[PDB]
Amino acid sequence: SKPQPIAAANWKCNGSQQSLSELIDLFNSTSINHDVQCVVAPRFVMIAMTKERLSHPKFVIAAQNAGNADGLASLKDFGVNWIVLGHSERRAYYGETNEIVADKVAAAVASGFMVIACIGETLQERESGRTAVVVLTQIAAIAKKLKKADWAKVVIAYEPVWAIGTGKVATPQQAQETHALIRSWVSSKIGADVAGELRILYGGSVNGKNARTLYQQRDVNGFLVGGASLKPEFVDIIKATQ
């Protein structure tokens, strides 16, 4: 049976204090009837106001990236206990190595954070048939820096770069193939119980209309949402996870 689903909002640099405060009031006033962990990641300079205003018991606040000693101590002091590491984008755009993100996941877990690590291929890798190789390389790099017990604090988000902000969502079939491959590797290499309890979320052009038929697939455990998370339809994406 599936582990607890997650619905995560990444606001990037978008929204004013007023527009974001309207979304928070909507979230606060929503009755959620099933078991789900909801996550909101505001820009750094909006973390304090979000902290003060967000009250729903099924919601936690996350930071948008954390590159060690430095900012981890600061975020921990401020009450923030989740981080979202956007590696598929940073790799594609700037050349960020797989070892860098692996080291960040390990350092965050050792400081007590829950971590959503975003892994994924480029348009060019997908078209050349290399999705499996690319994705398996990323998960393997992360695993090298972890011990078995650490996996309880890790969540994977499959976020192919061609689906981010483009309007081109993966089909339920494409998401299921990738999620199944990741889980299979984890079962063989790390352990069968670890694999069964791992959350694997899908991200890239998720919306209120397409979320339900993505969630039905065997190995999909929730969503990472960018553009549509700045809109009332985020509540529909939460409801799609049952």
From 87, 121, 125, 179, active-site residue: 87
Q: Which residues are annotated as a binding site?
A: 10, 12
Spatial contact of 38 and 59, defined as CB atoms under 8 Å apart: yes
Using an 8 Å Cβ cutoff, are 67 and 44 in contact?
no
Other CB atoms within 10 A of residue 60 CB: 19
- For residue 129, give Cα distances in angstroms to 182, 200, 206: 16, 22, 23
Give the largest Cα separation in the chain, rounded. 49
Q: Determine whether 159 is an active site residue.
A: yes
- Residues found in the chain: 242
34 is annotated as an active-site residue: no
β-strand partners of 118? 157
Beta bridge partners of 222: 6
Query: This structure's resolution (angstroms)?
Result: 1.6
Active-site residue (options: 52, 121, 125, 159): 159
Experimental determination approach used: X-ray
Known binding-site residue numbers for substrate: 10, 12
Domains and CATH numbers, the chain: 1-242 (3.20.20.70)
